[PDB]
Design a protein around this ligand. Sequence first.
Ligand code: SF4
Ligand code: SF4
Ligand code: SF4
Ligand code: FES
Ligand SMILES: [Zn+2]
Lengths: 677, 89, 114, 39, 54, 62, 130, 67, 209
Amino acid sequence: PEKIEVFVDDIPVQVVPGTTVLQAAAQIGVEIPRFCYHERLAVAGNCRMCLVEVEKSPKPVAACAMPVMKGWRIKTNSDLTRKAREGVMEFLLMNHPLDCPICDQGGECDLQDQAMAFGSDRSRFTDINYTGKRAVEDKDIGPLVKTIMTRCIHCTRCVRFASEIAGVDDLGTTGRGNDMQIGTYVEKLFLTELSGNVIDLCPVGALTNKPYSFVARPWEIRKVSSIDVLDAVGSNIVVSTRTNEVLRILPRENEDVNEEWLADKSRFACDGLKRQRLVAPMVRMPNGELQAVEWEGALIAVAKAIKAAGGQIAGISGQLADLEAQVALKDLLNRLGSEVVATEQGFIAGGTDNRANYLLNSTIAGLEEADAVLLVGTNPRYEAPLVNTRLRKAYVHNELQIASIGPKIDLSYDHENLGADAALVKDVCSGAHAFSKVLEGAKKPAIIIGADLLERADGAAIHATVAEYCKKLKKPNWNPFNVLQTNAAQVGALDVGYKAGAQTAVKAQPKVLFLLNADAGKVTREQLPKDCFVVYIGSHGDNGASIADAVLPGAAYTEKQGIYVNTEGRPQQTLPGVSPPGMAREDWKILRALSEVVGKPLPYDNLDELRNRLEDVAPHLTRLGQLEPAGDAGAIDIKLKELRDYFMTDAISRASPTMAKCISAVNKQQRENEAKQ
Amino acid sequence: RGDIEKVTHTGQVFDKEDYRNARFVNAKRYVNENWGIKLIEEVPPKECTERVVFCDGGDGPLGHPKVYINLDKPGNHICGYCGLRFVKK
Amino acid sequence: AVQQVRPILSVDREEARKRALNLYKAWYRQIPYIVMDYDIPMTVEQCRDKLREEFVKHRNVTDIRVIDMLVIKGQMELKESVEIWKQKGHIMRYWKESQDPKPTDFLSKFIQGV
Amino acid sequence: SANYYCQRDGRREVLPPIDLVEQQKQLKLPTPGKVYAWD
Amino acid sequence: KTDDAKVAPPSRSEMKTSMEALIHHFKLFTQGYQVPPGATYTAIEAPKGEFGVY
Amino acid sequence: EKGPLSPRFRGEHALRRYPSGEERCIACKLCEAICPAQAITIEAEERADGSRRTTRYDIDMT
Amino acid sequence: NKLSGKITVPTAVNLSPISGVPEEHIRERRVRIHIPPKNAMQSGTDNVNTWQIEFDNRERWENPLMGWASSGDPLSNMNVQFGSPEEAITFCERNGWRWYVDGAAKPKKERVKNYGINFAWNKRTRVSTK
Amino acid sequence: MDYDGSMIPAEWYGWMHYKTDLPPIRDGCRPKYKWIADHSENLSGTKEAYYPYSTTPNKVEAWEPKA
Amino acid sequence: DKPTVRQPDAVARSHLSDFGRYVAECLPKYVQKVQLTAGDELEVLIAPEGVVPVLQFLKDHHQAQFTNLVDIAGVDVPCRKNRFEVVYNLLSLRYNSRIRVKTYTDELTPLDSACEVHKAANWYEREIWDMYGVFFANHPDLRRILTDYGFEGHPQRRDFPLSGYVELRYDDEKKRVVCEPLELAQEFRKFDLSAPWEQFPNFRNANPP
Ligand code: SF4
Ligand code: SF4
Ligand code: SF4
Ligand code: FES
Ligand SMILES: [Zn+2]
């Protein structure tokens, strides 16, 4: 398709035909002011701020939605454009209220910025003295999104986002004329895993974070690039620190993975990093109370127990442990002579060796390219919401055939439910069902199996057959087999060489135990050997931490620099934005100190020494930001099938106050459905 | 002394065993006696007829910027700036 | 990876040493005067010892140009000590006696914070 | 009225520096200015 | 005062009523005003002499 | 005897209150953003009434 | 036999000693060459066209007296801009720092972004509302 | 003989500086609100002296072993 | 009809413009470029070697007679391979006009000295040497001016922390003032004042490589 030649501002430009004027102007470099246009939303002409003049224009055209045509001449900065822009902003600023100082988007508001650049500087609106402005009742929409609609400019970003990206469909417009409002005609709660993203979409401060309300201004605050850790998507984050306080979280545009959206859990659970925190080493007395002690006694006491326990030790890594903590943990236990190093979330026995057996080989970006997707009892909407919306983008732009072989769930879009019984996956893998024919006929089939199922029971057979069928489904440059990992450390464990299954470590019968912030109930001292001495090296004092005889504080993920391998497999680096509290240290530093206290020092006294020890173990694993290919790959009832299940998953999640409010609010709206009836 | 006992309206009292108490062994811990929360509570909620009213809080250019507050909802409506309260009924 | 560039003073590494050692002469010869002039604790042997270590401070300098500048700095500081523009505080600065050598081994770092 | 900012603004009016030789390429001994008898 | 409210701050009276006066008050005091790129010299007959800022 | 000054004299700082007695400050944080010496520090939250108000508001007259 | 005393010297000249930075910072601190992140709730993108370098966070505690954010770490705010990463790496070496680039992003892949797809007869992409 | 510069009260301060030509006895247009305190000297070097202190309740909550 | 917008002296632009070409075609080997900044001043961009010849040419030739050398303003700009830029802003009383000469240099190569041309510059070279470290060749005495004795580093560079690396106090053990590593009561809070929206189109593509 030959590219057209068009003189954007007296500069020849190349555009594939059908390109919009705006999309061409950015190509060359000029930017047109927009309000209702966004890269990842349907096109509409609402603001009329993107207007621009083309030579011999009877009518200025909206660049945002104007396909370019041969031999045009777009006069971006010609006076007619300037006349248009000023008039449009005089209009927008008529009856926007005088609420910048109390509006949380102050100093971050596109209306302010575009008023500065492209608007006038005098108020022709004289009617403030006669009849004033308009006003609109605010809406109740949830415990997360504070709504002040009297500032809205009806850009419909919220309308379009909800309808398409999240498919909630419950937020819309009403009325004619200047009294047109936005919201829900009757009071409801906009409850949705992706609901946070509307706060970033609303160009004006009509929708804003309830928790991060009034707390700080953008000019004061400081930005730190980082990566989300609460979900195995590993989305890129910009942690918004100000003076040793993580005020909020924002998505960092990494369209290969992050997609620029962000789930509610990652967005809002940041408060969890300020409550139930461990700020002092503790050791369990004969009274048993775990009084506070100092680092000297603590590690010395721990080194005492390890030496005299009798060389029967285990380490069970949690789910928020960075790969450095795993490697430091493993190396120390190899000095001690114990290879019992399990991970909480179990996995396939005897298939953990080929890299592609525990990843998303389908290139999460490529998921949107998928054509026929088969989700065997693997609810993405609450297991990987960012992955879920990628699928919906496919479902909307490429006719994605989405079947299900699990229990009932709702994916925000139609999906064919073939049953639940695990015998269905076998018949499909043989290719004896109608959707199997669809899979055959497709060009980008995908088969997604949730890691929970792979650890459920006797599921290694299920995986083996699934890999067996993927052999035929393989199309060049495309590996169908997909595994939505859940914890952000599981893939880290596999690349260092752990075992899988906390019960595995218990079955070893160790005299001492190590727990990298492992706050899952999968291990209980009752279920442990009675004499088993228990050491916990995690940040939040959660219940799993409650059952240890020694409790070493740790700095949470935002506070520590670590490496996390995301689901698909790229390794990514957190950066520390906040000084840790109390005596908290880095996890890989706690282990290193303990080794040298025992008398079996590790070789890595610095992060780089450790990062080179990982380089030894996996050169692929230190090529940050890249993804080495792995090639060939090798009833059903699941959790997180409702939002109520989703909000309370991890220790940080339970720690957060806002999430607890969210759970209560959803329960109450359900009760309203029962009783308001 | 009561000076180092009072609860600042912001909500702080030095813990009874907290070394930062020491700084007041010889100086007063000023705490203000007017708490805005109580005062605005006392002020009664003004009422009007029109669906939409306007507040500047103070007077003329001696108050906060003019703001329009709709009253169609049943409840009260608090001025964002001054905390004045409006009710149409 | 070479660049055909201007000189500053010294055209060859040996001229650089010639200049560098000239400075070492002035500083060695000066030390006794400063012990007298500046009423500070330091004694001649210690001042001489520091002068040795402070040249050793940068032994593996390689570029002709860089070593030229280091000498330019020294000739300046020489004159500022030769004449008494400096002060007893300024001259002692080379010892850094206000701060105790901070912990270095991992436990002392670990037990004393980042 | 007739008070548009676009047609009275200065900051959007200023240009980058021009290259005089290239100015000529587009196309009384000269003196910087009126001689002053600073004498 | 120069008429350009994008350059010098607006008056309080206009600020508390009109909208873009408030925006301009807001942006000028927080971000200031972009100055077009360039270098310039100036001098003044200050009492000590020609005081200048480059 | 003493003086004279003018009404604009710039001296001791003070945080005023509305005619009702309510705090005028709303934590808009412009004062900090402009303060040439960066002598102002502010931290604001929601009082239980839901109003945008300061918690800490500090000035260093050194 | 000279061009005003010109000399042949390697292009890469380490300048750590002449610089004046204490060796403590030079030997314990890295640099994070990158492009500044794009603000999430903005849409103009003319402040992320430059390559930026800074130094890793060290520490921040609070002043016991007044509860400020005390910090005894000098290169905390330090921040410099460049036009291209290779320029910055060249600079960073010449000042003898340890650094590790952070690849910004691949060129944006064209998105069709048609208007007609909003209204289609068969495709799922029909808009629910306007 | 302990006169001080701060003994002047608020309502008279302006007149005393030639800052207002309206004696407080004459202009009753100034505010007469309730919360207004009464005057005070530069209470310094004495037990009545001000002394600063943090005005933010603590940031991060510690985990409680008992609960 | 725009009272806000000033109107420069056009005739002054005329004279400076033609004169600028005069300088360019009279010193071909040195003058790299001559431009007329919109602020009506005239800039003369030379190569580092011609510093003295340009200055000597200006102060002496009839048509220039730029006698006073107002200052030596130093500019630092990383991302320019030889970054440290220098500006020689001159005056001419005979013709009542101002001119600016500019040159570049790196942190390593030395630079010509104006001490032999204008006695006025002597202190300025000392000032830039102290403030950036730009050596000057043939300068009589390159002693530091502003910074205190035994100060390491040149602060006006943009790769130097604002508050410096060390700070002083007083010791009782030693009856003397000691320099210590930095320690700040309240860390200097930057503010990120970056424009998201390009407020100036005219400079966008202009001056491209
Ligand atoms: S959205 Fe907020 S910041 Fe923007 S103009 Fe409106 S009140 Fe001001
Ligand atoms: S609420 Fe926000 S996103 Fe929705 S139309 Fe109004 S301004 Fe746009
Ligand atoms: S934060 Fe500062 S500028 Fe804003 S209202 Fe309060 S005192 Fe005034
Ligand atoms: S961006 Fe084109 S009308 Fe809104
Ligand atoms: Zn009000």
